Amino acid sequence: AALRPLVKPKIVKKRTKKFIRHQSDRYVKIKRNWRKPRGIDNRVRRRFKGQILMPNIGYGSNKKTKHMLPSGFRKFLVHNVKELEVLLMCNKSYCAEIAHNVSSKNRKAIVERAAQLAIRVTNPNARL
Template structure:
């Protein structure tokens, strides 16, 4: 399956591999279980506009949420944490690694079955093309390969 999608060309003792991005699969893909998918919202943020929805721990002496009364909104705690094996894992089964240049891509060479690259937002389109080409040679999956790449018709 993988061998059919990888074409190796031998040219003056240099191996160049072209890999289709769809063929790159993680080594193992465990089921990702989220204990809570709803966001924790701040107490009374639904009541007043000036109180933002971002979570803040209630610290009042009489606060019902802090005292964990029945029927009140829940507070985040350690029990909602993710499984250690699936923490920071993308739905594809890879873990993300931020890349700013081609040299940083070399780090993922040995761990291309568990980690994928994401090109940083401040990388120019010229450097992006080089990163995408090198990632194809190293069989590294990129989460955003088409970002900021213009077609040759527009140029």
């Protein structure tokens, strides 16, 4: 029963799946990472049928629900204590993410400050 949002809209995602690179499957030297294919002959790029789909714009996401975590609070990468008080007003629309490389002692310091002033933290219960 944590820190509810200001407003919880229906988040919709036009495609939920990743955009693998052509032949990232056969070859190990290819990372899944998109690289747009500029083959003269290549079937993908001539948007051919039942081939891998190409990442294009209009097949991107709603302005409101853009960038927005399943709960509602978009991240901030909070990185020490002082950076947390930035969200003190913008508490209820978006939350704290505590950076990977903060040391377990201040990883704690930040958390209980957050809860003090009611800012959600997505990894509150992490290093311990």
